[PDB]
Write a protein that binds this ligand. Sequence first.
Ligand code: ZN
Length: 130
Amino acid sequence: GAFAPHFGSPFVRTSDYGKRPGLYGDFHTGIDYAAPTGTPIPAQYPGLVDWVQSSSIGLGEHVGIKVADNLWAMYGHMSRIRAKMGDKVKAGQIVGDVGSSGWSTGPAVHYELRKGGPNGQHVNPDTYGG
Ligand SMILES: [Zn+2]
């Protein structure tokens, strides 16, 4: 996983990427890490902030960071966004605060890997890149 997420404490992984338990029903498009609302989200990989959105839908408050030539890391369900568009960010820079914005049951951060663009196709962060 060349761009797998490596959140430390207090982030705890809850729902994996891909088809959920059983053979029918839902498909998680990223990896959910649980943590209290307000927990600062440190960026996993350096890149350019080229996508910021506030909505009450799906990922809700989220940022996209271009972390590779054709790969964008998305950090979602924020309670507060702290990156501005154009920001060059380093790994471990705090890009936001955990929330439950959008379509999330409780407090967690949704890490999604997209190819083709900030609204592009999602991939498996655990496996993409090796
Ligand atoms: Zn999710």
